[PDB]
Design a protein around this nucleic acid. Structure first.
Ligand SMILES: [Mg+2]
Ligand SMILES: [Mg+2]
Ligand SMILES: [Mg+2]
Ligand SMILES: [Mg+2]
Ligand SMILES: [Mg+2]
Ligand SMILES: [Mg+2]
Ligand SMILES: [Mg+2]
Ligand SMILES: [Mg+2]
Ligand SMILES: [Mg+2]
Ligand SMILES: [Mg+2]
Ligand SMILES: [Mg+2]
Ligand SMILES: [Mg+2]
Ligand SMILES: [Mg+2]
Ligand SMILES: [Mg+2]
Ligand SMILES: [Mg+2]
Ligand SMILES: [Mg+2]
Ligand SMILES: [Mg+2]
Ligand SMILES: [Mg+2]
Ligand SMILES: [Mg+2]
Ligand SMILES: [Mg+2]
Ligand SMILES: [Mg+2]
Ligand SMILES: [Mg+2]
Ligand SMILES: [Mg+2]
Ligand SMILES: [Mg+2]
Ligand SMILES: [Mg+2]
Ligand SMILES: [Mg+2]
Ligand SMILES: [Mg+2]
Ligand SMILES: [Mg+2]
Ligand SMILES: [Mg+2]
Ligand SMILES: [Mg+2]
Ligand SMILES: [Mg+2]
Ligand SMILES: [Mg+2]
Ligand SMILES: [Mg+2]
Ligand SMILES: [Mg+2]
Ligand SMILES: [Mg+2]
Ligand SMILES: [Mg+2]
Ligand SMILES: [Mg+2]
Ligand SMILES: [Mg+2]
Ligand SMILES: [Mg+2]
Ligand SMILES: [Mg+2]
Ligand SMILES: [Mg+2]
Ligand SMILES: [Mg+2]
Ligand SMILES: [Mg+2]
Ligand SMILES: [Mg+2]
Ligand SMILES: [Mg+2]
Ligand SMILES: [Mg+2]
Ligand SMILES: [Mg+2]
Ligand SMILES: [Mg+2]
Ligand SMILES: [Mg+2]
Ligand SMILES: [Mg+2]
Ligand SMILES: [Mg+2]
Ligand SMILES: [Mg+2]
Ligand SMILES: [Mg+2]
Ligand SMILES: [Mg+2]
Ligand SMILES: [Mg+2]
Ligand SMILES: [Mg+2]
Ligand SMILES: [Mg+2]
Ligand SMILES: [Mg+2]
Ligand SMILES: [Mg+2]
Ligand SMILES: [Mg+2]
Ligand SMILES: [Mg+2]
Ligand SMILES: [Mg+2]
Ligand SMILES: [Mg+2]
Ligand SMILES: [Mg+2]
Ligand SMILES: [Mg+2]
Ligand SMILES: [Mg+2]
Ligand SMILES: [Mg+2]
Ligand SMILES: [Mg+2]
Ligand SMILES: [Mg+2]
Ligand SMILES: [Mg+2]
Ligand SMILES: [Mg+2]
Ligand SMILES: [Mg+2]
Ligand SMILES: [Mg+2]
Ligand SMILES: [Mg+2]
Ligand SMILES: [Mg+2]
Ligand SMILES: [Mg+2]
Ligand SMILES: [Mg+2]
Ligand SMILES: [Mg+2]
Ligand SMILES: [Mg+2]
Ligand SMILES: [Mg+2]
Ligand SMILES: [Mg+2]
Ligand SMILES: [Mg+2]
Ligand SMILES: [Mg+2]
Ligand SMILES: [Mg+2]
Ligand SMILES: [Mg+2]
Ligand SMILES: [Mg+2]
Ligand SMILES: [Mg+2]
Ligand SMILES: [Mg+2]
Ligand SMILES: [Mg+2]
Ligand SMILES: [Mg+2]
Ligand SMILES: [Mg+2]
Ligand SMILES: [Mg+2]
Ligand SMILES: [Mg+2]
Ligand SMILES: [Mg+2]
Ligand SMILES: [Mg+2]
Ligand SMILES: [Mg+2]
Ligand SMILES: [Mg+2]
Ligand SMILES: [Mg+2]
Ligand SMILES: [Mg+2]
Ligand SMILES: [Mg+2]
Ligand SMILES: [Mg+2]
Lengths: 77, 10, 46
RNA sequence: UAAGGUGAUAUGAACCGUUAUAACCGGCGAUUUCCGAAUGGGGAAACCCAGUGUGUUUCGACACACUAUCAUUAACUGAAUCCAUAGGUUAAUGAGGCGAACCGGGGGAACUGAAACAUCUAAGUACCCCGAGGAAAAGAAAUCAACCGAGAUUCCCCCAGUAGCGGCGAGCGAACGGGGAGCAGCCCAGAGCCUGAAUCAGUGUGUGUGUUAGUGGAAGCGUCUGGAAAGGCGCGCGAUACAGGGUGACAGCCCCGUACACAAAAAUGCACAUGCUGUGAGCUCGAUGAGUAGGGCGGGACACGUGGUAUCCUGUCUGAAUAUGGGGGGACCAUCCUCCAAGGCUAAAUACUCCUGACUGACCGAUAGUGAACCAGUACCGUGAGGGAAAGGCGAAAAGAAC
RNA sequence: UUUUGUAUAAUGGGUCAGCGACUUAUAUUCUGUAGCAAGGUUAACCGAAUAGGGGAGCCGAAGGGAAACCGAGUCUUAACUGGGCGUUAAGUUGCAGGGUAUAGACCCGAAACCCGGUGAUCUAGCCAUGGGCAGGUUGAAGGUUGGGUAACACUAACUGGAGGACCGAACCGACUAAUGUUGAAAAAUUAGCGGAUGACUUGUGGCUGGGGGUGAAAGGCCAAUCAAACCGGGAGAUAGCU
RNA sequence: CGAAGGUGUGCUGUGAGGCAUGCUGGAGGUAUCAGAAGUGCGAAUGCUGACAUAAGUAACGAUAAAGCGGGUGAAAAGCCCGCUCGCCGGAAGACCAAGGGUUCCUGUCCAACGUUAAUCGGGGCAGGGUGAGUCGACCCCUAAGGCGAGGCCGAAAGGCGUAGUCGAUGGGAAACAGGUUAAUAUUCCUGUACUUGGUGUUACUGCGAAGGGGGGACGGAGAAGGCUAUGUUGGCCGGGCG
RNA sequence: UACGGUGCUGAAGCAACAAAUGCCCUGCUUCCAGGAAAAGCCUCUAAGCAUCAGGUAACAUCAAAUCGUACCCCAAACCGACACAGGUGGUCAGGUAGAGAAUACCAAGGCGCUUGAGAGAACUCGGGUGAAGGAACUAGGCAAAAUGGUGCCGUAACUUCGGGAGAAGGCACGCUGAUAUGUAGGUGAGGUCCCUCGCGGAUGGAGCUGAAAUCAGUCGAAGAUACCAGCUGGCUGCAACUGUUUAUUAAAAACACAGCACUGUGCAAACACGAAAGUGGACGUAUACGGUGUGACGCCUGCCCGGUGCCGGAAGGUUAAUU
RNA sequence: AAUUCCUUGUCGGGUAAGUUCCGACCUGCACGAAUGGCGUAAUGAUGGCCAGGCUGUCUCCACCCGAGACUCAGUGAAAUUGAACUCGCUGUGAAGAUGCAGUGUACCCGCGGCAAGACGGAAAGACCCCGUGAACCUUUACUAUAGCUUGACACUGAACAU
RNA sequence: CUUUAAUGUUUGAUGUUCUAACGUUGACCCGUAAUCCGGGUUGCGGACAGUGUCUGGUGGGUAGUUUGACUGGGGCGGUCU
RNA sequence: AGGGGCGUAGUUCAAUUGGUAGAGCACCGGUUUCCAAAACCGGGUGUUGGGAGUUCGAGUCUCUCCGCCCCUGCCA
């Protein structure tokens, strides 16, 4: 499903407003993208379904560090 | 219930 | 004149039988309701 | 525990027991067909079809055992592709489903009210989904206060229908503060000096107190009416027992019990003590949670509907300081107070009752009370989901009417 | 009962018996009553516990003003001789009652909306695999053999067996009329009628599910129910109406 | 020494009522003053049960048709037997599938059930009855389609789908005639056959796949030809002389 | 001997002809709309065995389990609340007449339909017949009556040349005899030849079966005598037609239809179903597919782009998030 | 004219008489060219009109055969129903009387018939109206929204040229 | 101040060429007894396409509703202070 | 019937909408032509349907009255 493998972002629900404040139910989905990340330690490309916010944290945290948390999370990358 | 036929005025 | 009921044991068991009902949770919820109600005959299977 | 006993309609037959292997009650085991998470495969549930291995032989067969999937772990093997990796085969553990309500979370209406109807209300209700426990959740201040102070969370009564929110309509509706119930605080973000300290979890070992069968348990006769006395009329007696029930009409003394006094081979709860197995206590010096806080955009949650709107959560886009520093004090700034987020754990006070036991009712008494006092979620109806009844009383004793 | 008005030929009732509708909680106001009284009273909770404790609070004894404030006065105004509102007047806590408010709010009754399920054993379409269509006619293309042409074309005869072809049983349809209408039957029977090798018909399975299906299209059909199925829930929806 | 209840009677109050009694019944009932209400019913096309009305009226379910004698029996238009008559005969006969579940056969009975009576019954009761290597199913095989390891996707639930695994209405080995029971038969019996596997013996010996190929294997219509089922006649056999 | 029965015995048990919708035939011929799969079965070799195993063949032998099996099954046993004038798939298909599974009468077989008995009114239902007239009835020839078969003769406008057409209209039909005692035809034995020899070939015609026609005679009012079995013609509206539709008051001029045109769509197609994956479209590719309107065929389809849509253009005006 | 209100338009044909039909006329209230126009063989349980045949359709019904209806025996409903000792007339009267006034008539009670009335029975009227009812449907009604489409940012980089 | 010529800078506008994100319902290899999927190789495309947030337009495609009263019945007409 | 519109030169139409009514054609007169017309020059024309008003003043504004158009007259 539409779940980020790094941040865990999942769809949330809200309201469409209007000039008359009419509220209609909607969904907010993450900006997910399938990317092949180069992991140096295994000299391999591993494909992850990540959000755009997740992409920013990968540079800051390091590719190895995030995967270590993923193995702790048992997300089965 | 049934089929009340009719001659309703018109 | 042909009516709404034409018996067919194979069709009856494949449609409402114990294995057909229990295959899905929705049918399993029917069994749960009938078990809660205390029905003598849970499903239509003999 | 026992002189009676082989469940009921429901007799009978054939028997078993009588002083302790009848029966009955309880504890612990044994057995526990088939279907069902169903798990060897399949399947129209209670059926069909196997494989492997061990052991049997009358050479026709036969009897057990194992063989689901997924998760986790460990071995062995094993591509493209040299290592590897994916993958594959075993072996260990664990999970599967069911179940009333209560709980947390993920989703989430409309009728209705507004005398219409869009914002709003209904309502984060109904319902669906996920997960957990006996409770859950929450929880140890980047909290409130106001220049005085308080000191985790939860629950109750106030504060108060106040302050506010709101087509400022309908309606929604606090907090501060106060009185109570109950109270408990800790760990990691790191190394030493000490040292196994406190404490917690496993387990045995006893004690105490329960639970699962039980034991004893007081004291009245006469007469009258009457089918029958427990009633009447007399005269007694017991009471830590005059709670109830039954007995041929209303029984303290007829029976079962009740008040009291006792009981456990075995299993088990609870609590204390104690022994092992882990578990680390104390001191010093450090360290002090970053794509985070904050911001832009779109929503949501706070009583608070964007409003001048703080605070909280974030789908999106950005993005700090970091103790010489930050957060908050309902726009915002200064001053001053207060606290230290971006890591965790935590009993009690709280909610509920499918179920067990006892007891209670100005609750019902067969069209009432559960739909069901009766072989009722039955008969019956409907393809199905589902809907769903009617139906109690002979008499003290069946003596149920020989002829 | 409803009405200006009912013997009314307006509604209701075959009869009896049973059942069947002003209640409950909280808050508020008013009356009655009881207690205390410028005071009255506690809530949660504690408690051998309907006592007692708990005065946390609540109402009242002081109001005026938007408010700050002032205060038996106060506001208005620059100021009032003024004017508005106040100042002599007992309240408060129980109990009962009359009301109101929030809850279903005396009871019964909608057509509907929403939510979760059950239904294509009927019917509609489609899919797979099977079956059925007596008999009698008409005689296409093509083919052969002639006649004709340089060769065709063309023509004749004979073979052939084409068709949402013909007549007509089974089968399928359902146009007319009669009967039947508390039926033999919740759509049929009788006498006629249309199609009847096809866009045919049928058996057995399968698939499409409710704002959806399916529809050679009528708002038709989707289990005797269809301009939005059925079942349960929201739900005792709502009903200025009877 | 007769409570409530019921059913009469009498008295009494302004009323809702009250008091007492005779009978029924056979065990509860309850003063007074207070307290609490599921506290008072004729109606709501009210609800449930019982009972009327129409009413001994309509109807007694195809206009295919009955009649008689005898029998059984308490009783015969309806049952049994017999003789006639009539009806169907591409069905109103016979055998199945689907579906039902004992309705089958025998004995016994007539309350209820049968639109009447019933001796009878598909009614009640008690027994009996369903016999398979070849018929089916199961089994092997697949169609549509379903499920679906992993996998892809999706708030959750879940959706789709690969390898696979199910799923006949289709494809796959083999039995016929005769006899027999109150009720069963290609199942039992008699006679005569056949098939697929297992094992063993003997002889001769290339076997072998989840693989390849072949086969299985397929339309509509039409036209005949060769046949049989079957029927007719003759012959034959037996019987008949009306 | 118990009306059953039981036991014993038991003759002929042939031919010809007719003849299927069954079989050969899952064939043959032909057509376009171009008509399952898999396994069993046969065969081929890989790896893995090739002394073995395994295969082939012949005997002997075992095994073939389990479940269903009664009965109803176009109905009183199933679906319709009923012992319900309804519905329900397959198999079997006698005689006479007949083209026939129509129809009539029968066989085998099975039934008389679970209230009767009387009476013989009105009226109602289902039928029969009808003087005279013959649609005067009525919204309307509704209904009824009538027509009805085979052979032959004959047959118009119009036509898309097929039709219209069974157009209309008419004639002959029984029975007996003769042609010809039972014909033409069909079938075909014996016999006689031939065979590289059989379920053979050629002759051969016995015996069966058997129309149709003509002639002669004969009966009746009537000979397609019953049942069965078109009413016909003329003008015209609408729709081309076969078909489909409101299960249960509407079968039509409505829908569909072939044909025509416009438009979209270049295939990871458009489009549609799906939060998505995917699927259909299509295992198709513009000679294709989707949508829309019209609705065979014949002759034709004119004028308006102002309005509203759609398409193309993009300079300018205006204009969001963002900065 | 499936289209013509006036309208039975006018004329002709058909009839004894034709508001229908057929042929023309054009004055098209308010036909018209793929929401196709005009024709069209064949087809049609198609609509209208006419003729022959044919007849109980009718003038005008009669008889007969069956099944009911009627009588007897057996079994044995239903809808409905405030209670009835349930006459006519005229008048009155929630304004159309079995029930009121006046008056007339009428012995008590069945059976077979006919339906004028009991504003007969059936079903809280479908027409009409109302409610600040319901539902579907339409659109340039309102407010939204799926979808489609535009741009910015993100996924998303490099170099060069203007 | 104007006119501004050049100068660096900071943002954009196109155009061209790349590959390395991303796409591939191209080919090939493996998982593998596999028209799924995944991985690998390669080709093609390529900073587009596509998707997310925000945003303008369109939108009976689908919803929730409104659409007055008086009135010699209503509608139409007229009226509403 | 009811409601809206219309009446302007000889015929078809503008109007200003409170203060003075135009255009086209037609008509007339004069050119041109052998002549007619076509063409050229020049020009006169109106109670603005009728009435009653409103105004200092109406074809204009108001209301009736004639004539001519356009709409409606519906549910049973
Ligand atoms: Mg298993
Ligand atoms: Mg409202
Ligand atoms: Mg527990
Ligand atoms: Mg004791
Ligand atoms: Mg910190
Ligand atoms: Mg931020
Ligand atoms: Mg925000
Ligand atoms: Mg505001
Ligand atoms: Mg402001
Ligand atoms: Mg704010
Ligand atoms: Mg009782
Ligand atoms: Mg009860
Ligand atoms: Mg109850
Ligand atoms: Mg009872
Ligand atoms: Mg009166
Ligand atoms: Mg009355
Ligand atoms: Mg107290
Ligand atoms: Mg105080
Ligand atoms: Mg004052
Ligand atoms: Mg008081
Ligand atoms: Mg009160
Ligand atoms: Mg045809
Ligand atoms: Mg025809
Ligand atoms: Mg036909
Ligand atoms: Mg229906
Ligand atoms: Mg709806
Ligand atoms: Mg419901
Ligand atoms: Mg509610
Ligand atoms: Mg209600
Ligand atoms: Mg008494
Ligand atoms: Mg007693
Ligand atoms: Mg009550
Ligand atoms: Mg009534
Ligand atoms: Mg009755
Ligand atoms: Mg009678
Ligand atoms: Mg009567
Ligand atoms: Mg009668
Ligand atoms: Mg009768
Ligand atoms: Mg009968
Ligand atoms: Mg007899
Ligand atoms: Mg017969
Ligand atoms: Mg039985
Ligand atoms: Mg029997
Ligand atoms: Mg009897
Ligand atoms: Mg029986
Ligand atoms: Mg056998
Ligand atoms: Mg068997
Ligand atoms: Mg077989
Ligand atoms: Mg699947
Ligand atoms: Mg899976
Ligand atoms: Mg299988
Ligand atoms: Mg099969
Ligand atoms: Mg063929
Ligand atoms: Mg033969
Ligand atoms: Mg049998
Ligand atoms: Mg039998
Ligand atoms: Mg039947
Ligand atoms: Mg029925
Ligand atoms: Mg039945
Ligand atoms: Mg049938
Ligand atoms: Mg017949
Ligand atoms: Mg008669
Ligand atoms: Mg009649
Ligand atoms: Mg006749
Ligand atoms: Mg006669
Ligand atoms: Mg006559
Ligand atoms: Mg005559
Ligand atoms: Mg006439
Ligand atoms: Mg007449
Ligand atoms: Mg007719
Ligand atoms: Mg006739
Ligand atoms: Mg003709
Ligand atoms: Mg006409
Ligand atoms: Mg047609
Ligand atoms: Mg037709
Ligand atoms: Mg119909
Ligand atoms: Mg139909
Ligand atoms: Mg019809
Ligand atoms: Mg059309
Ligand atoms: Mg055109
Ligand atoms: Mg245009
Ligand atoms: Mg234009
Ligand atoms: Mg007309
Ligand atoms: Mg005329
Ligand atoms: Mg005409
Ligand atoms: Mg037209
Ligand atoms: Mg057009
Ligand atoms: Mg016609
Ligand atoms: Mg005639
Ligand atoms: Mg009367
Ligand atoms: Mg009168
Ligand atoms: Mg009268
Ligand atoms: Mg009558
Ligand atoms: Mg009558
Ligand atoms: Mg009436
Ligand atoms: Mg109504
Ligand atoms: Mg709408
Ligand atoms: Mg609403
Ligand atoms: Mg109104
Ligand atoms: Mg109104
Ligand atoms: Mg109308």
């Amino acid at each position: 499903s539409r779940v980020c493998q790094v941040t865990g972002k999942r769809p949330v629900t809200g309201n469409n407003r209007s000039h008359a404040l009419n509220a209609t139910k909607r969904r907010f989905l993450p900006n997910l993208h399938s990317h092949r990340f180069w992991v140096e330690s295994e000299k391999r490309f591993v494909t992850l379904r990540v959000s755009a916010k997740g992409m920013r944290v990968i540079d800051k945290k390091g590719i190895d560090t995030v995967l270590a948390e993923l193995r702790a999370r048992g997300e089965k990358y | 219930a049934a089929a009340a036929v009719r001659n309703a005025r018109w | 004149m042909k009516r709404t009921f034409q018996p067919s044991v194979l069709k009856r068991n494949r449609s409402h039988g114990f294995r057909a009902r229990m295959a899905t949770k929705n049918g399993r919820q029917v069994l749960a309701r009938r078990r809660a109600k205390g029905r003598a005959r849970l499903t239509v299977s003999k």
